[PDB]
Design an enzyme around this catalytic site. Structure first.
Site, PDB file in Angstrom:
ATOM      1  N   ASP A 150     -20.448  42.210 -32.221  1.00 26.97           N
ATOM      2  CA  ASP A 150     -19.715  41.305 -31.349  1.00 26.97           C
ATOM      3  C   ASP A 150     -19.149  40.153 -32.188  1.00 26.97           C
ATOM      4  O   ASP A 150     -19.552  39.930 -33.331  1.00 26.97           O
ATOM      5  CB  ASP A 150     -20.655  40.824 -30.230  1.00 26.97           C
ATOM      6  CG  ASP A 150     -20.112  39.650 -29.417  1.00 26.97           C
ATOM      7  OD1 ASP A 150     -18.941  39.254 -29.576  1.00 26.97           O
ATOM      8  OD2 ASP A 150     -20.884  39.114 -28.594  1.00 26.97           O
TER       9      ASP A 150
HETATM   10  C1  LIG Z   1     -27.619  21.134 -30.092  1.00 28.51           C
HETATM   11  C2  LIG Z   1     -26.200  20.624 -29.848  1.00 28.51           C
HETATM   12  C3  LIG Z   1     -25.705  20.731 -28.385  1.00 28.51           C
HETATM   13  C4  LIG Z   1     -25.684  22.172 -27.804  1.00 28.51           C
HETATM   14  C5  LIG Z   1     -25.266  22.309 -26.307  1.00 28.51           C
HETATM   15  C6  LIG Z   1     -24.080  23.286 -25.992  1.00 28.51           C
HETATM   16  C7  LIG Z   1     -24.290  24.255 -24.770  1.00 28.51           C
HETATM   17  C8  LIG Z   1     -23.588  25.659 -24.845  1.00 28.51           C
HETATM   18  C9  LIG Z   1     -24.064  26.745 -23.827  1.00 28.51           C
HETATM   19  C10 LIG Z   1     -23.007  27.111 -22.737  1.00 28.51           C
HETATM   20  C11 LIG Z   1     -22.919  28.601 -22.304  1.00 28.51           C
HETATM   21  C12 LIG Z   1     -21.623  29.350 -22.658  1.00 28.51           C
HETATM   22  O1  LIG Z   1     -21.635  30.303 -23.389  1.00 28.51           O
HETATM   23  S1  LIG Z   1     -20.012  28.803 -21.936  1.00 28.51           S
HETATM   24  C13 LIG Z   1     -19.130  30.227 -21.068  1.00 28.51           C
HETATM   25  C14 LIG Z   1     -17.688  30.477 -21.578  1.00 28.51           C
HETATM   26  N1  LIG Z   1     -17.024  31.674 -21.032  1.00 28.51           N
HETATM   27  C15 LIG Z   1     -17.339  32.991 -21.377  1.00 28.51           C
HETATM   28  O2  LIG Z   1     -18.235  33.181 -22.201  1.00 28.51           O
HETATM   29  C16 LIG Z   1     -16.569  34.145 -20.732  1.00 28.51           C
HETATM   30  C17 LIG Z   1     -16.338  35.386 -21.629  1.00 28.51           C
HETATM   31  N2  LIG Z   1     -17.005  35.258 -22.929  1.00 28.51           N
HETATM   32  C18 LIG Z   1     -16.310  35.356 -24.151  1.00 28.51           C
HETATM   33  O3  LIG Z   1     -15.103  35.553 -24.071  1.00 28.51           O
HETATM   34  C19 LIG Z   1     -17.043  35.211 -25.517  1.00 28.51           C
HETATM   35  O4  LIG Z   1     -15.998  35.053 -26.415  1.00 28.51           O
HETATM   36  C20 LIG Z   1     -17.854  36.462 -25.951  1.00 28.51           C
HETATM   37  C21 LIG Z   1     -17.472  37.681 -25.112  1.00 28.51           C
HETATM   38  C22 LIG Z   1     -19.329  36.130 -25.788  1.00 28.51           C
HETATM   39  C23 LIG Z   1     -17.572  36.825 -27.489  1.00 28.51           C
HETATM   40  O5  LIG Z   1     -16.341  37.297 -27.615  1.00 28.51           O
HETATM   41  P1  LIG Z   1     -15.841  38.309 -29.056  1.00 28.51           P
HETATM   42  O6  LIG Z   1     -16.355  39.647 -28.598  1.00 28.51           O
HETATM   43  O7  LIG Z   1     -14.344  38.104 -29.045  1.00 28.51           O
HETATM   44  O8  LIG Z   1     -16.592  37.642 -30.186  1.00 28.51           O
END
Ligand SMILES: CCCCCCCCCCCC(=O)SCCNC(=O)CCNC(=O)[C@H](O)C(C)(C)COP(=O)(O)O
Ligand SMILES: CCCCCCCCCCCCCCCCCC(=O)OC[C@H](COP(=O)([O-])OCC(O)COP(=O)([O-])OC[C@@H](COC(=O)CCCCCCCCCCCCCCCCC)OC(=O)CCCCCCCCCCCCCCCCC)OC(=O)CCCCCCCCCCCCCCCCC
Ligand SMILES: CCCCCCCCCCCCCCCCCC(=O)OC[C@H](COP(=O)([O-])OCC(O)COP(=O)([O-])OC[C@@H](COC(=O)CCCCCCCCCCCCCCCCC)OC(=O)CCCCCCCCCCCCCCCCC)OC(=O)CCCCCCCCCCCCCCCCC
Ligand SMILES: CCCCCCCCCCCCCCCCC[C@@H](O)O[C@H](CO[C@H](O)CCCCCCCCCCCCCCC)COP(=O)(O)OCC[N+](C)(C)C
Ligand SMILES: CCCCCCCCCCCCCCCCC[C@@H](O)O[C@H](CO[C@H](O)CCCCCCCCCCCCCCC)COP(=O)(O)OCC[N+](C)(C)C
Ligand SMILES: CCCCCCCC/C=C\CCCCCCCC(=O)O[C@H](COC(=O)CCCCCCC/C=C/CCCCCCCC)COP(=O)(O)OCCN
Lengths: 459, 56, 175, 178, 88, 84, 53, 70
Positions: free
Chosen positions: E43
């Site tokens: 991924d």
């Molecule tokens: C310690 C410092 C602070 C930390 C706090 C930060 C908190 C972050 C946690 C929030 C949760 C989330 O993921 S926020 C949610 C954002 N939206 C989505 O994840 C929808 C679809 N996902 C994608 O498109 C991704 O890219 C993916 C398929 C995984 C890879 O893609 P590839 O296949 O192109 O690599």
């Protein structure tokens, strides 16, 4: 005094009877010899003066200015040799003639036992400078600059003439010795107030005073390198010399009348030092620095104490040398980049290391690093002002801080950082430019060994 | 070569000549300001047996 | 040294303690200053002897200039430029000599402060009193003339001061 | 650095950049490697639970709360690689970088030393002189009308061609010239 | 400094070392030209983790714009060589 | 003269999670249903001469043994010499 | 020129003033005179204007 | 290790040439001056202050101590 005046006059037929390709060599050699001869005026007395004749006299205030004037001409010729290459022999001879005439008028002005003769020569210096600015300047603003440099001056100088003749109609003489020996107090009257103003404003405009300084940035920016050198080094000091001479008849009215000019200078030094921090042009920054230094000299002359006068003399000499060096460095950059914009050519230390050393030493002397004569004059004036009033220390220290800030800002912007990529015409520094820089800077560090030569008649 | 470089270097001699002429003129102007020679209260001096003027 | 007058620049008789070594361990200061003497002082002394003989071979003298007294600004008519010139030059020479006197007294005070060490506050009262007296007199003469000073301005200041003194004395007498 | 930028960042690129930033800042917080590995696996898990969301509005409401949380807990003094734009040796060796054209100003006595280097330099200069004339025409014919839309450059198409505008990329001074 | 002048062989070996120490990839099927997305089924989160591992193992940072388009070990090696100016 | 010895890398199969804090990290990760994939990339930090650690006070007491022995020998010799 | 300026004769009379002050201080210290006087000119030769106020 | 690389840098020829020229000329005049000054001090010596003899008026240059100043 004729043993200096006659050779300077003979510089003209020698220039006009020279070969087409020997004018610079002959002019430089004989101007250097005239400087060496004039160097023997420094043997001054603890008593009155060197009264050569009824027309000319020398003083330990006049002698350093005379020597600096004679020393400036060879440097001006060396600086002018480059950008006048593509020009006809007659026009180059005319340019050298203008420089020689300026030197002759300045030499006769600084001795000038008569006040009317002093005024005549002090205004005769106007013509060569105006011709140099409006003939051999580059931009289209030069004409406008010339107009300013003209009318401001005359706007101050025409009343003075009236005052001068008025004095001779009452006193009976305008000889400086007779004036000094027969001086009398000025009563607090409206007529005396206006006589004071007519005597002061002409020299105030050419320092220049803070409110009356508009002509200086234009005139210094649009002038060629020799014009800028002579404007900053010698022509600005005519006002200080005239004030130092003329304040002998203005007592005790100076005590009251000095306040507006003292406030103008003390606030304008801060204003112009702050202006230097935000400047997109090197020449304009150097011009505003000159305005700040001359504001300090104005304060010194207005306080009229022995330490004030010594500091003012030292600062005038040191500023002349330092500002001429700074203008020469800026012009060396300009003749390569043709822009005169400070932010354009960057990181020149990596390409011109010796020129970077020259930049550093010039910034250090402008910054008034001890034991330079710049700091000697600065400190003497500051101590005199502190005795005058303890609150001047805030303004003086703020001016020192801002001066260091803008000097190092100028050094860091042009010499440090990364070189500009698209500029590929930065050629190695010529021997002429390095020799010019050394001939500016060694006299300063060598004068710090014998300060009494430039501390004036009250030492 | 003599009579050839003179026609090309004659101009050089002028500045030095001016310096000498100015010195001579300064002395000549000095000769007109002797109204008080050996007469000031500070330097009233009795002339040496083989002296004409205290200073020239 | 004979190169300067001991009365103008006095010094105390310079009492120094005698070495009293309570231990037999050799102090490095003595040996080190002896080797300094051997390696430095003798060659310098011999070079000075050479230079002094060469100077003695050629002996010539220079003189201190004597200046006559002339009438001062008080015996000068209101517009007589020649006597005013003489008096002004004399007054300037006297002003320079007074400055040098103050310099001598200040040098005395500085030498006393450095010499008496930790007890300078008590052992330099003489020099402090001398400097106070000289400073008061110099201030009374030349404090406020400013730039463009002259004998006439000094005379006017003296006349004003002594008019004030005469007024104060007359007020005290008629109290 | 090398790659030309686009007009915008897509949602996936934003999520991946947030992932990298959060992991680096968590490493700054979690100094030790075992603690960092544990918390980084937890962090990856917390990203993964919304990997399959189909609603773009939901996914955009996410990443926003996430970047707000990041800004709240972002370790105001994160670890920076020494050569990175915030590092302690970022532009240390820029003062040693001299342009190649400066060698044209050398004195002949200076070029007498290193003759092979200057012969090869002459060869390079000749190659540049010819390749430039080819490159201008190739760029003029390949650019779309109205000007370029993206600052991406084409490669060479023919045998003897060189990539357009190659001289100042090939002749970089060095990473550490001195 | 005294840092050895690393070569292409060292960069390739070290990149493959870091990749074989990633246990989501079987080392025997790994090759220099193997794609990350399709030849190994990783991924994009795994790809950015691999970029972070390369950064931490070579001591310098790859910017996001350049890192997000590095999909083979060979082109990772090429990027590192171009950044560090490796001769052979 | 530089360091040109043709250094060869160690075997990659050498590194194991066993016997390191990475083991308990993996254990606690498995308690919630996750795995650490980069564990073996960090095993070299707990393997060789880095395997054994020292405490802060132990770091402070780096040379207490032989210095203490010198102290006791010196004090005994001084006691023997002055008792004369 | 620098060497010429370095060796310029003492026309400012610095050593002359120092020697004059030295002998003057020696004289006044020997006679017990109060070093510098506060009056620059002798008061006997100044004629003040009588006020009679 | 024969890994010597070419160092790109600006020409130092002109700066060195200017420094050599300035040093040469300054020394060309200053070395004779220093030697002469030392020689004058060593053999000529310096005038010693003396009282003016009666009936003798000194020259204006006889009121100075250093032989070069005189
Ligand atoms: C310690 C410092 C602070 C930390 C706090 C930060 C908190 C972050 C946690 C929030 C949760 C989330 O993921 S926020 C949610 C954002 N939206 C989505 O994840 C929808 C679809 N996902 C994608 O498109 C991704 O890219 C993916 C398929 C995984 C890879 O893609 P590839 O296949 O192109 O690599
Ligand atoms: C400190 C004691 C020194 C004793 C040794 C004698 C030194 C004599 C120097 C005379 C003046 C130098 C001439 C100026 C132009 C420089 C020429 C040049 O280009 O160099 C080429 C030459 C060859 O180098 P390169 O590789 O070819 O060129 C590569 C680049 O140029 C790159 O070159 P760079 O990176 O090496 O930079 C060049 C260098 C040189 O460039 C400069 O910046 C020099 C000018 C600095 C002064 C700035 C003005 C401020 C006012 C100070 C006035 C002091 C003058 C005193 C009287 C001098 C008489 C003339 O600049 C510096 O290194 C920065 C130094 C900052 C010093 C600031 C401190 C000032 C006050 C110090 C005390 C002074 C009073 C002491 C009182 C108590 C003790 C008695 O380099 C040198 O030889 C270096 C010059 C010597 C360093 C000067 C630093 C201190 C000297 C101060 C003046 C004399 C002190 C007298 C007291 C003695 C006891
Ligand atoms: C196994 C061993 C067996 C043998 C053992 C015996 C032999 C060996 C051991 C014994 C000997 C030990 C050492 C003995 C030392 C004395 C011996 C001796 O020979 O005495 C002779 C003689 C003896 O003295 P005296 O006749 O008894 O005393 C009369 C006074 O000295 C009359 O005063 P004055 O007016 O003549 O003074 C002039 C003054 C200054 O001269 C000037 O004013 C010249 C002005 C020129 C200005 C313009 C210069 C040119 C433009 C430069 C531009 C640059 C860009 O000269 C000096 O400055 C000398 C400085 C001495 C310093 C000593 C240490 C001071 C340290 C203080 C600070 C300490 C903490 C740091 O003294 C001298 O010859 C002094 C020579 C000074 C030479 C000055 C040169 C100036 C050059 C101007 C142009 C420069 C251009 C640049 C290149 C210059 C050339 C490098
Ligand atoms: C490259 C690295 C360094 C190599 C070189 C190493 C050597 C360094 C030594 C030089 C600098 C160190 C400072 C030490 C100074 C020693 C000389 C000094 O003491 O002499 C000075 C003497 O020099 C002069 O005072 C200063 C020179 C005057 C400068 C005139 C300028 C030249 C004309 C140029 C045109 C003018 C342009 C500016 C117009 C105002 C002061 O002496 P002073 O105690 O006082 O009396 C002289 C001797 N007496 C007693 C017999 C009278
Ligand atoms: C613009 C850039 C700078 C240019 C130069 C600026 C410097 C010029 C400043 C002029 C210096 C002072 C001028 C007058 C000073 C006199 C003292 C006065 O200010 O105080 C009061 C003066 O009172 C009032 O000022 C009376 C005059 C009122 C009219 C003046 C106009 C006010 C503003 C004008 C300023 C414009 C300046 C530029 C003109 C073009 C005290 O009143 P009094 O004690 O009873 O009389 C004192 C005078 N005696 C003794 C001779 C009789
Ligand atoms: C940079 C531009 C500045 C322009 C000039 C600024 C200076 C202005 C100074 C005044 C100008 C003329 C003054 C006269 C010259 C001195 C002569 C004198 O002192 O004689 C006075 C004469 O005094 C005058 O006549 C003064 C009249 C002034 C008229 C012109 C006014 C100009 C503007 C006034 C306001 C601004 C003043 C200061 C401006 C400073 C510059 C900004 C007394 O003589 P008597 O009258 O014969 O004897 C008394 C018994 N009857």
């Amino acid at each position: 005094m004729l043993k200096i005046i006659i050779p300077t006059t003979m510089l003209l037929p020698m220039t006009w009877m020279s070969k087409h390709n020997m004018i610079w060599i002959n002019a430089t050699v004989h101007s250097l010899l005239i400087s060496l001869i004039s160097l023997s005026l420094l043997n001054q007395l603890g008593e009155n003066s060197l009264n050569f004749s009824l027309t000319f006299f020398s003083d330990s205030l006049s002698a350093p200015l005379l020597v600096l004037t004679t020393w400036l001409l060879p440097l001006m010729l060396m600086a002018s040799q480059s950008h006048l290459s593509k020009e006809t022999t007659t026009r180059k001879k005319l340019y050298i003639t203008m420089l020689i005439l300026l030197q002759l008028f300045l030499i006769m002005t600084f001795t000038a036992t008569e006040l009317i003769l002093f005024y005549i020569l002090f205004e005769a210096t106007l013509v060569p400078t105006l011709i140099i600015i409006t003939r051999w300047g580059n931009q289209t603003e030069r004409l406008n600059a010339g107009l300013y440099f003209l009318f401001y001056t005359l706007a101050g100088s025409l009343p003075l003439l009236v005052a001068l003749v008025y004095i001779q109609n009452t006193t009976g003489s305008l000889n400086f010795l007779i004036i000094h020996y027969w001086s009398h107090p000025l009563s607090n009257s409206w007529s005396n107030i206006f006589m004071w103003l007519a005597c002061i404003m002409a020299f105030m405009v050419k320092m220049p005073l803070y409110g009356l300084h508009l002509w200086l940035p234009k005139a210094h920016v649009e002038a060629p390198i020799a014009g800028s050198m002579v404007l900053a080094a010698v022509l600005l000091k005519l006002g200080g010399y005239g004030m130092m001479r003329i304040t002998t008849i203005l007592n005790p009215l100076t005590n009251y009348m000095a306040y507006p000019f003292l406030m103008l200078s003390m606030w304008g030094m801060i204003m112009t030092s702050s202006i230097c921090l935000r400047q997109t042009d090197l020449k304009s920054l150097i011009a505003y620095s000159s305005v700040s230094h001359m504001a300090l000299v104005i304060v010194a002359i207005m306080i009229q104490t022995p330490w004030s006068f010594m500091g003012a003399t030292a600062l005038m000499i040191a500023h002349g040398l330092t500002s001429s060096m700074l203008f020469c460095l800026a012009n060396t950059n300009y003749e390569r980049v043709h822009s005169r914009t400070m932010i354009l050519a960057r990181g020149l230390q990596t390409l011109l290391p010796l020129m970077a050393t020259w930049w550093l030493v010039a910034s250090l002397t402008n910054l008034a690093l001890p034991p330079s004569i710049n700091l000697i004059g600065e400190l003497f004036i500051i101590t005199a002002s502190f005795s005058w009033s303890n609150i001047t220390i805030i303004l003086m220290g703020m001016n020192m801080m801002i001066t260091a800030l803008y000097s190092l800002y100028m050094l860091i912007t042009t010499q440090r950082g990364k070189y500009t990529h698209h500029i590929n015409n930065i050629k190695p520094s010529f021997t002429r430019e390095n020799a010019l820089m050394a001939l500016h800077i060694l006299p300063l560090l060598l004068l710090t060994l014998n300060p009494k030569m430039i501390l004036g008649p009250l030492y | 070569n003599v009579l050839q470089i003179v026609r090309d270097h004659w101009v050089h001699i002028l500045v030095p000549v001016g310096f000498v002429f100015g010195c001579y003129l300064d002395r000549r102007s000095d000769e007109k300001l002797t109204a008080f020679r050996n007469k000031s209260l500070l330097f009233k001096r009795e002339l040496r047996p083989n002296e004409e003027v205290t200073w020239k | 040294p004979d190169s300067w007058d001991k009365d103008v620049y006095p010094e105390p008789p310079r009492r120094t303690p005698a070495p009293a070594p309570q231990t037999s361990l050799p102090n490095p200061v003595t040996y080190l200053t002896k080797i300094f003497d051997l390696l430095v002082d003798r060659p310098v002394t011999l070079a000075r002897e050479f230079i002094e003989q060469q100077h003695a071979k050629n002996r010539y003298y220079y003189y201190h200039r004597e200046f006559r007294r002339v009438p001062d600004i008080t015996e000068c008519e209101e517009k007589d430029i020649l006597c005013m010139f003489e008096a002004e030059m004399q007054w300037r020479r006297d002003y320079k000599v007074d400055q040098e006197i103050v310099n001598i007294i200040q040098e005395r005070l500085k030498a006393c402060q450095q010499r008496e060490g930790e007890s300078y506050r008590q052992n330099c009262a003489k020099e402090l009193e001398q400097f106070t007296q000289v400073s008061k007199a110099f201030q009374d003469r030349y404090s406020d003339l400013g730039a463009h000073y002259s004998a006439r301005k000094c005379l006017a200041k003296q006349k004003q001061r002594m008019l004030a003194e005469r007024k104060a004395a007359k007020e005290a007498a008629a109290a | 650095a090398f790659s030309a930028p686009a007009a915008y960042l897509t949602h996936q690129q934003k999520v991946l950049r947030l992932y990298k930033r959060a992991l680096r800042h968590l490493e700054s917080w979690c100094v030790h490697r075992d603690k960092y590995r544990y918390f980084a696996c937890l962090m990856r898990a917390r990203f993964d639970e919304h990997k399959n969301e189909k609603d773009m509005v939901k996914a955009t409401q996410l990443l926003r709360q996430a970047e707000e949380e990041f800004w709240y807990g972002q370790h105001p003094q994160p670890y920076i690689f020494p050569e990175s734009p915030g590092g302690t040796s970022y532009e240390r060796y820029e003062c040693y970088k001299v342009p190649e054209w400066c060698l044209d100003d050398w004195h002949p006595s200076e070029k007498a030393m290193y003759p092979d280097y200057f012969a090869k330099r002459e060869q390079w200069k000749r190659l540049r002189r010819e390749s430039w004339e080819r490159e201008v025409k190739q760029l003029q014919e390949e650019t779309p009308p109205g000007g370029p839309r993206t600052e991406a450059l084409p490669p060479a198409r023919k045998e003897g061609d060189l990539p357009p505008l190659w001289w100042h990329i090939v002749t970089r001074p060095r990473e550490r010239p001195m | 400094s005294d840092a050895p002048p690393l070569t292409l062989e060292a960069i390739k070996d070290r990149v493959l070392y870091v990749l074989k120490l990633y246990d989501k990839i079987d080392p025997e099927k790994l090759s220099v030209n193997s794609h990350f997305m399709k030849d190994l089924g990783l991924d994009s989160l795994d790809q950015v983790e691999i970029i972070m591992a390369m950064e931490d193992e070579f001591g310098f940072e790859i910017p996001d714009i350049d890192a997000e388009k590095l999909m083979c070990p060979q082109e990772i090696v090429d990027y590192i060589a171009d950044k560090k100016d490796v001769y052979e | 003269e530089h360091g040109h010895s043709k250094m060869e890398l160690p075997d990659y199969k050498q590194w194991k999670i066993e016997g390191t804090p990475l083991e308990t990290v993996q254990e606690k990760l498995a308690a919630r249903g996750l795995r650490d994939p980069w564990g073996r990339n960090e095993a070299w930090r707990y393997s060789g001469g880095f395997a054994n650690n020292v405490s802060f006070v132990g770091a402070l007491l780096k040379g207490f043994k032989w210095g203490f022995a010198a102290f006791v020998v010196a004090v005994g010799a001084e006691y023997y010499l002055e008792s004369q | 020129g620098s060497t010429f300026v370095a060796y310029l004769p003492d026309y400012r009379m610095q050593e002359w003033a120092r020697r004059e002050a030295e002998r003057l201080v020696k004289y006044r210290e020997a006679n017990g005179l109060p070093l510098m006087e506060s009056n620059c000119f002798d008061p006997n030769k100044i004629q003040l204007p009588e006020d009679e106020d | 290790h024969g890994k010597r690389l070419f160092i790109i840098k600006p020409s130092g020829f002109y700066d060195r040439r200017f420094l050599k020229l300035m040093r040469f000329y300054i020394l060309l005049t200053g070395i004779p001056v220093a030697i002469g000054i030392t020689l004058v001090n060593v053999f000529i010596g310096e005038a010693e202050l003396a009282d003016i003899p009666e009936g003798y008026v000194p020259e204006h240059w006889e009121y100075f101590k250093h032989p070069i100043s005189r």
